């Protein structure tokens, strides 16, 4: 995020880091319950990647984090790699998240919900702060 | 290019798809929602993460960080997967698994 700010630690408890098995962060995701994460289809997550829950500082060795294994990846079949449309994948965890103060679920909308133009929303992540 | 150790957040406005087409033209589909061009941007390593809006006192997943400016320009909107367009698929996937 460019021109954002540091979050309050643990205040976005659905935010996960998708890490390969060697430890590098390549994508975000959101817990929607103890067994499921929503992420982007283009991230190309595999069952060898790790869901890291409860993280604030990726340089800390002292946070209470959960390293969760992935049972199965469900990429939306309508995902189009030419147009980047329908960019969603569900990860089914083999090791359920233990919900806590710092680990918990985001709500999903109804298909009919209206999020009007001009509404102030929020995005979070560990993306670059400068290109 | 600077990669933060600590989780970042930014508040930013949603756009209409018609207004987003000023920036990205026919690339903007029904299953996308744009947000930003407001002095902040999603950037490389934010992909797959959330765009959340309050509904009824609770944070709701409206978008999934997807694509945009190759420079993370803060005067161009980011493009997010529109969760309302994809949530029937989410719920059927959970219910079948």
């Amino acid at each position: 995020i460019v021109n954002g700010e540091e979050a309050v630690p643990g205040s976005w408890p659905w935010q996960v880091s998708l890490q390969d098995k060697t430890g590098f962060h390549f994508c975000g995701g959101s817990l929607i319950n103890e067994n499921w994460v929503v992420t982007a289809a283009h991230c190309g997550v595999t069952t060898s990647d790790v869901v890291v829950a409860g993280e604030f500082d990726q340089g800390s060795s002292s946070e209470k984090i959960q390293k969760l294994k992935i049972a199965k990846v469900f990429k939306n079949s309508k995902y189009n790699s030419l147009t980047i449309n329908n960019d969603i994948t569900l990860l089914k965890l083999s090791t359920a998240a233990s919900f806590s103060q710092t680990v918990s679920a985001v709500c999903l909308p109804s298909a009919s919900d209206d999020f009007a133009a001009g509404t102030t929303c929020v995005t979070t992540g560990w993306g670059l702060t400068r290109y | 290019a600077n990669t933060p150790d600590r989780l970042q957040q930014a508040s930013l406005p949603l756009l209409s798809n018609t207004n987003c087409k000023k920036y990205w033209g026919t690339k903007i589909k029904d299953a996308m929602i744009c947000a930003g061009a407001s002095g902040v941007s999603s950037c490389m390593g934010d992909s797959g993460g959330p765009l959340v809006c309050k509904k009824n006192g609770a944070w709701t997943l409206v978008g999934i960080v997807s694509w945009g400016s190759s420079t993370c320009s803060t005067s161009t909107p980011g493009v997010y997967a529109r969760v309302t367009a994809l949530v029937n698929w989410v719920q059927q996937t959970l219910a079948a698994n």
Binding site: E5, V8, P9, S11, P13, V106 | -
Partner: peptide, 13 residues
């Protein structure tokens, strides 16, 4: 869902 035990604080509210 969607109510963090640690409430987020955003500049400008």
């Amino acid at each position: 869902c969607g109510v963090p035990a640690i409430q987020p604080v955003l500049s400008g509210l």
